[PDB]
């Protein structure tokens, strides 16, 4: 899931059209990947 987060953290920076990944994209990404940990 570490690569599950870090690859998905680029999508947050891309969906708001940035060119640098910020430190609030990762903490936005952890709360989605660990949500599926809480799913089944």
């Amino acid at each position: 899931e570490v690569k599950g987060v870090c690859t998905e953290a680029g999508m947050y920076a891309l969906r708001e059209r940035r060119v640098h990944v910020t430190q609030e994209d990762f903490e936005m990404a952890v709360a989605k990947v660990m949500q599926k940990d809480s799913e089944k």
Binding site: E16, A31, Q35, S38
Partner: protein, 105 residues
């Protein structure tokens, strides 16, 4: 305690009161903390559009990317559609002020 949904409200409410009392970077932080909290609730049925508005407020409070800030107020209005007429009619203001700010009259 048990709840998770009401944490979204008080973080979003603090996001209202640092910007209204003129403190942008602390309002940036509390808005961000409500982003990473609302990413785990299964049903934000109406609170998403409430969060979609002030995602566009603070991002337009620095005037960096008007086009993406326009996209927040679009989704903030689509959530408000036909269920909340006081909050919907103010949502036309923030999308068309940004569109004039986009210089497409």
């Amino acid at each position: 305690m048990d709840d998770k949904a009401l944490l979204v409200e008080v973080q979003l409410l603090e996001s209202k009161t640092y910007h209204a009392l003129s403190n942008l970077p602390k309002a940036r932080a509390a808005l961000t903390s409500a982003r990473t909290t609302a990413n785990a609730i299964y049903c934000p049925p109406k609170l998403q559009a409430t969060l979609d508005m002030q995602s566009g407020i603070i991002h337009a409070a620095e005037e960096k990317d008007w086009k993406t800030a326009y996209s927040y107020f679009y989704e903030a209005f689509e959530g408000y559609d036909s269920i909340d007429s006081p909050k919907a009619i103010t949502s036309l203001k923030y999308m068309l002020l940004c569109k004039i700010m986009l210089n497409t009259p």
